[PDB]
Amino acid sequence: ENLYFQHMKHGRVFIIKSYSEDDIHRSIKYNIWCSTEHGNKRLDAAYRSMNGKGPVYLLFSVNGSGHFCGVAEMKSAVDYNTCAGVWSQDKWKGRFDVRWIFVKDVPNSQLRHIRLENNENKPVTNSRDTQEVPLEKAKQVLKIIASYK
Ligand SMILES: [Cl-]
């Protein structure tokens, strides 16, 4: 048995959908991310309301790739006035620190059966960028990712 994730009681978990393999490479290399304006606001609000009582997890997936590519923890609030042009979209506004804790490809077929009640019961694999995941579903996702081979 593995009951690690079933036991966590605090934590908030978001899907990260990126169009760009380059942005994923840069994130892993430098432990930073940037989302859209509204994505940054959602993530910033979740980070600031957490108050270190629990982690904000990011489940990264490249749009159209058919798989998740890893997991990171948010490690700062969003700084919105930062160097422009560092991401694929040259206008992207801001930066927050992350810490990647898991880098590997998990096929969508391993996760498609988990559905999200806050997103019309759609498969978690059909989420848009910064879709939040209910903690009870997130536990199931994290277990599958951590145990995939
Ligand atoms: Cl926006």
UniProtKB/Swiss-Prot annotation:
Induction, per UniProt: Following heat shock stress.
Positions of the UniProt region annotated as Interaction with m6A-containing mRNAs: 9-149
Domain annotation YTH: ranges: 11-145
Modification note: Ubiquitinated by the SCF(SKP2) complex, leading to its degradation.
Subcellular location, record wording: Cytoplasm, Cytosol; Cytoplasm, P-body; Cytoplasm, Stress granule; Nucleus
Binding site for RNA: K17, S18, Y19, D23, W33, C34, N63, W87, W92
Tissue: Highly expressed in induced pluripotent stem cells (iPSCs) and down-regulated during neural differentiation.
Function: Specifically recognizes and binds N6-methyladenosine (m6A)-containing RNAs, and regulates their stability. M6A is a modification present at internal sites of mRNAs and some non-coding RNAs and plays a role in mRNA stability and processing. Acts as a regulator of mRNA stability by promoting degradation of m6A-containing mRNAs via interaction with the CCR4-NOT and ribonuclease P/MRP complexes, depending on the context. The YTHDF paralogs (YTHDF1, YTHDF2 and YTHDF3) share m6A-containing mRNAs targets and act redundantly to mediate mRNA degradation and cellular differentiation.
The family this protein is said to belong to: Belongs to the YTHDF family. YTHDF2 subfamily.
This protein's name: YTH domain-containing family protein 2
Gene name of the record: YTHDF2
